[PDB]
Design a protein around this nucleic acid. Structure first.
Ligand SMILES: [Zn+2]
Lengths: 129, 50, 40, 41, 236, 67, 117, 52
RNA sequence: GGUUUUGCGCGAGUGUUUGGGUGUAAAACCCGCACGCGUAAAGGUGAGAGCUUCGGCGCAUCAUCGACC
């Protein structure tokens, strides 16, 4: 669209960055990330550690998980695998459990610098309603 | 920047420095500040009625 | 009166489960090359 | 005591020289295509 | 460990105080008995101090002179710790690559160029020391031209911790841009010596192995451009 | 944080801003090289800046600001 | 639920901080009157009645006469030295007796009793 | 300053918030070798010349 | 007092302000136990955004065949 509804200035910074990327690269990943950055909070539901742990199963354990939402901790998950996740926000228990398992935590600008086009990324959405 | 210099009573630096706290590297969010200031400026209000 | 007793026990069991859940959270939360240690 | 050219400016100048060479080549090919197009029409 | 009171003065707001602290670190490293027992943590702390010393330098000519002198710090160390010193430099640059702003980034690119040039100059003594060349080429094989994305620093022990550091992509791209310039400046590109040709071929083979087995399109394109330089013996 | 201070200055409040009803905003800052409030001319939101000012003696100086 | 004349019975609480100041000044007045003494009396530990709150304990009204006799504190001296007495409560078990007796000897271990004159 | 270091660890239920952006310098993010390398060639200029 | 949507903080938790402490005193700052609300008490196949070492991997969601109470 024309403007994000968010008043977070850093969100608008991410929107400017991914507008530039979507314009100057032929990568559908950047366009999808920009579209999800424009979207509202109810349309960006929280993604739990267990849902990522399920999706990191076949050959995606070496891929970088990208979540345009907040990753939340799941108490049902007893063992957290090693994971490189790039998300808007992390809850304190989720970030602590990811880093305690040898994994890593990323923001979207570090993703845009390390992976400008989204090569070998795993885009994950949270459950609707 | 890790350290901030300490100044004396004459305005010249003493030579000692202090470590800058983490709270100076906090996010600067004018929307949160606007919301909380709008709420907090109303809390010393005396009621009026006819 | 037996029905009433098991409803009261269900309410008490819910309350005890809530306190056990609070206790579980506290336990989970408890489970030199730095700026403020090198430049101090 | 000479101020050196900054490194990102060196990278930018190299990319600009490459883009200028590609632009000149594309202009020459498009001129040739224009001449053959005029004859065929 | 080591009594280093000049580290906190390297990040001060006074250029004279920072110069005195830099001279203190100069005198610290010239002492052979103290600089012989240099572990990884000491050179990491020293390079953090040097990072902030360059970070607070203001004008262009002072920045160039400071980068030159931090590069020339290699010549005042015992042989047994030069590799650890350079590994500490590369670890600091890998830790703090994405945190630098766009105005202070340029002097740090210059610092990387000058340190790489001084490391290539250090290999001179066949006219080249094979042990020194092997150390420099291994350090080039592990931080900038690595086939692995991560580096393990120190050992998992009851006393020392583990530092697991990623290699940022921008450091790889900058080293790919500058390595041909550095080896031309210090003189590996002469056409008569066999040993210099072997060193150049080893570095070019490292770049090629980076090109074939990478997942970054930026690294692939930049290494293709780096191997296509007209100063290389293959493309000549 | 040049962009963040620019957003705070431009979208919320700046003490050096003169808002006119004629299609242009002005910058009251003395070190502004053009007295206009826009992104490139801001002396505060640009860390590296340069201006030209004249002293009461009549001598004209160039002022340079670094990060 | 506004069927009745609720306008004549709206209670606002603009005097909440003023009443807090009044309560703190009342505690200060109690401190001024009882200068070395605490402003509160000692109260026993009791178990909450129902099955829902049986697990937790709270403060009671006053110590049982058996608890005071077992702790070595006479009944008539106890209200004059800061201990609350409740003649209605019974112990009913050897576990509340021991707990409140321990509380009373802990109070006795940390008490500075002054002579009458 | 020393107690400013101290009292932000003493607030219960609050930790210092993590930003959603690591590097807030957008010119460092866009004008960097990391992004400029994968960028396709520009499709125009800032000002477009009028064709007809 | 209900309900829908936009922003924000925290997030399987959340809500300091009944009250206590504190104060430069109706402000601001802090929180001991409760309490309200909520959570607790991974299957196949086919589409499918996106990624790809070009072999494939496949979000959310839907259809269909199954599993448990
Ligand atoms: Zn302005």
């Amino acid at each position: 669209r024309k403007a994000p509804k968010s008043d977070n200035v850093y969100l608008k910074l991410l929107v400017k960055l991914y507008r530039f990327l979507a314009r100057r690269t032929e990568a559908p990943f950047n366009k999808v990330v920009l579209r999800r950055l424009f979207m509202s909070r109810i349309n960006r539901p929280p993604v739990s550690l267990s849902r990522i742990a399920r999706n990191l199963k076949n050959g995606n354990e070496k891929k970088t998980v990208v979540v345009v939402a907040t990753v939340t901790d799941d108490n049902r998950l007893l063992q957290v695998p090693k994971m490189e996740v790039a998300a808007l926000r992390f809850t304190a228990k989720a970030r602590a459990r990811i880093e305690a398992a040898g994994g890593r935590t990323l923001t979207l600008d570090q993703l845009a610098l390390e992976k400008p086009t989204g090569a070998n990324t795993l885009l994950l959405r949270g459950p609707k309603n | 920047r890790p350290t901030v210099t300490v100044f004396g009573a004459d305005g010249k630096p003493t030579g000692a420095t202090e470590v800058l706290p983490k709270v100076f590297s906090a996010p600067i969010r004018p929307d949160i500040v606007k919301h909380v200031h709008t709420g907090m400026a109303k809390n010393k209000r005396q009621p009026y009625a006819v | 009166n037996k029905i009433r007793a098991e409803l009261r026990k269900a309410k008490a069991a819910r309350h005890h489960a809530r306190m056990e859940q609070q206790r579980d959270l506290l336990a989970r939360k408890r489970q030199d090359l730095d700026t403020r240690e090198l430049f101090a | 005591n000479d101020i050196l050219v900054p490194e990102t400016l060196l990278k930018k100048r190299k990319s600009q020289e490459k883009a200028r060479a590609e632009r000149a080549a594309a202009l020459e090919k498009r001129k040739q295509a224009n001449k053959e197009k005029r004859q065929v029409i | 460990e080591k009594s280093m009171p000049f580290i906190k003065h390297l990040a001060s707001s006074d250029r004279k105080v920072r110069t005195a602290a830099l001279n203190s670190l100069h005198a610290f490293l010239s002492a052979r008995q103290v600089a012989s027992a240099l572990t990884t943590l000491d050179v990491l702390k020293l390079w953090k101090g040097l990072f902030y010393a360059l970070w607070m330098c203001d004008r262009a000519i002072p920045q160039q002179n400071l980068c030159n002198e931090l590069a020339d710090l290699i010549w005042q160390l015992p042989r047994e710790s030069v590799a650890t010193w350079l590994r500490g430099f590369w670890a600091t640059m890998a830790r703090e690559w994405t945190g630098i702003d766009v105005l202070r980034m340029e002097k740090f690119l210059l610092l990387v160029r000058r340190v790489l040039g001084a490391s290539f100059k250090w290999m001179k003594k066949g006219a080249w020391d094979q042990s020194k060349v092997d150390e420099v080429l291994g350090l080039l094989a592990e931080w900038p031209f690595s086939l692995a994305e991560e580096v393990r620093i120190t050992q998992s022990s009851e006393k020392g911790g583990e530092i697991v550091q990623k290699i940022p992509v921008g450091m790889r791209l900058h080293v790919l841009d500058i390595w041909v310039d550095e080896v031309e400046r210090v003189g590996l590109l002469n056409e008569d010596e066999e040993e210099a040709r072997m060193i150049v071929q080893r570095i070019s083979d490292m770049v090629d192995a980076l090109e074939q087995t990478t997942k970054s399109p930026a690294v692939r394109t930049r290494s293709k451009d780096s191997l296509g330089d007209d100063r290389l013996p293959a493309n000549r | 944080s040049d962009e963040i201070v620019w957003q705070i200055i431009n979208q919320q409040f700046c003490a050096f801003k003169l808002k006119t009803t004629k299609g242009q905003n002005f910058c009251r800052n003395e070190y502004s090289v053009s007295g206009l409030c826009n992104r490139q001319s801001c002396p505060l939101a640009n860390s590296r800046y340069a201006t030209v000012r004249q002293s009461p003696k009549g001598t004209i100086y160039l002022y340079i600001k670094t990060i | 639920h506004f069927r009745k004349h609720w306008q004549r019975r709206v209670r606002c609480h603009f005097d909440q901080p003023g009443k807090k100041v009044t309560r703190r000044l009342a505690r200060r007045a109690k401190a001024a009157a009882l200068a070395p003494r605490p402003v509160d009396k000692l109260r026993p530990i009791v178990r909450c009645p129902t099955v829902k709150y049986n697990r937790r304990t709270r403060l009671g009204r006053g110590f049982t006469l058996e608890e005071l006799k077992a702790a070595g504190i006479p009944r008539l001296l106890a209200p004059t030295i800061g201990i609350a007495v409740d003649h209605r409560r019974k112990n009913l078990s050897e576990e509340s007796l021991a707990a409140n007796v321990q509380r009373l000897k802990d109070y006795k271990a940390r008490l500075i009793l002054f002579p009458r004159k | 300053i020393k107690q400013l270091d101290a009292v932000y660890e003493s607030k219960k239920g609050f930790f210092l918030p993590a930003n959603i952006v690591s590097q807030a310098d957008l010119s460092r993010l866009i004008n960097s070798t990391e992004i400029q390398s994968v960028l396709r060639a520009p499709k125009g200029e800032a000002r477009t010349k009028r064709a007809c």
